[PDB]
Amino acid sequence: QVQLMESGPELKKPGETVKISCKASGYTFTDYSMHWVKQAPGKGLKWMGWINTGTGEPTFAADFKGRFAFSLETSASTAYLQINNLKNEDTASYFCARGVGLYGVDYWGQGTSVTVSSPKTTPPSVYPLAPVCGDTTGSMVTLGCLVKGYFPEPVTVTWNSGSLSSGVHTFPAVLQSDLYTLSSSVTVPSSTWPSETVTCNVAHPASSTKVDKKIVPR
C-alpha cells in the first residue's frame, strides 16, 4: 500500500514563504525520485522539477528556478517543497508524485492548496433575493441568496438547514477586491412559496459566523 500524504492547506500573504511536506509510505523512499507539479485553479498540470531521492539533489524547470527549493529528510521518508517571496500567481494546488524514471510519475499525493493575498479575515454580508415578475416559469419559482465580501473560503450555504437540497444550484466563489462572493438559487413550486418558509443559511467558520436570511416577497 503505497501512499503519498501531503501537509494541509495554507494561507499566506505576499512576500511570505511556505514549505509543503510530502510523506511517502509503503515503499523504499530512496529507490524512487520525487517530482513536484503545480496546478492552477483553471488550469492544466505544469511540471516544476524533481529531486534525486538518493543524492538529495533538485532539478528545476526553467519557469520554477530561483524562488523554489526541494529538500529531503530521508530518515522520515518525506520530501519538501518551499516557495520563497510568495507572489500572487503562486495561488495553486501543488502535488508531489513518485518518479519512475523514463516512465514519468505513478503515485500522486493528495495535493496542497496555497492561497496568496493581503486581505484579512472578513465575514460575509448575506442578501436574500426575492423574485420579481418573470421569475416564475410554469409551476416553479426561483429564489436566491447572495453572499458578498468574505475571506477566506469556504462558506457553507444550505437551504432550510439542508432539507431543501432537491432543486438547488450553489455556484463557486469568485474574487472581487481580494474578497469572495458566491450565489445560490433554489427552485420550488409556486404553491409552496411564499406560503411555506424558505431560508438560506450561511456558515463561515473562519469568522465564527452563522446567519439565516428568510426570503420574503417584495
Added chain:
Amino acid sequence: DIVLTQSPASLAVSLGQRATISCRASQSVSTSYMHWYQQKPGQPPRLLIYLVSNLESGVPSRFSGSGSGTDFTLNIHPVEAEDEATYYCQHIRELTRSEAGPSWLEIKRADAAPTVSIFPPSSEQLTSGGASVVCFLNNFYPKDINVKWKIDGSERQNGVLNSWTDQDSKDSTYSMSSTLTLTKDEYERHNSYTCEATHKTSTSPIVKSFNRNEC
C-alpha cells in the same frame, strides 16, 4: 520545449460507447514513454497507462493505450459513468516533463434551454450603498453559453462576474450565475436592467429584465 496537443478539448459520451482520445507530440520520436492520467474534480490525478500501452495495476481492462513516437491514443472500449473526468496525457521521454492540455469527458443528454431568473438589489444591500443585479441561468445543455448585460438598452461589460457549475449529477445539465455590481447611485440613475443569453437551443437571445419604474 516539447508540446503535447490533446483533442478534442471536450467529448460528450453515452455509456457503452467506445471513445478515443488523441494526443500528439511536437518533437521526437518520443518513443513510447507516454502516460495517461485521470483527474476528477477536487482530486489528485490517478495513473492509467504507463509507456502508452500498459495499464497500471488497478485500471479496468476497458482502458487501452496505443500509438508510438508522435501519435498516441487512449481508448475506453465501453465508457462507464464512473469514467467521467478529465484525461491528461504526459510524455516522460524528455526533460522538462510536459503534459498536454486535458480532454474533458462529459455525459451526453438531450439539449435544454436555460431557465433564466433575474433579481434586483435586495433592500438590505441598497441600505449599505451597494447594488448587485444577479441573473441565474439554470439547467441548460450543452455547456456553451454567452451572456450580455444591458442597461436601458445599452450593453454593459464592467462590473460583471460569472460563475458556473460542473455537469449536474442527476439531470447532467450545467448552470450559470452572472452578477452586475454597481454603486447604489449609478443603479438609481437607470431604469431597465436585462440579462440575455445566447445558447444553441434558441435562435433568439433568452431575455430577462426588470424596470425599476414598473413598480
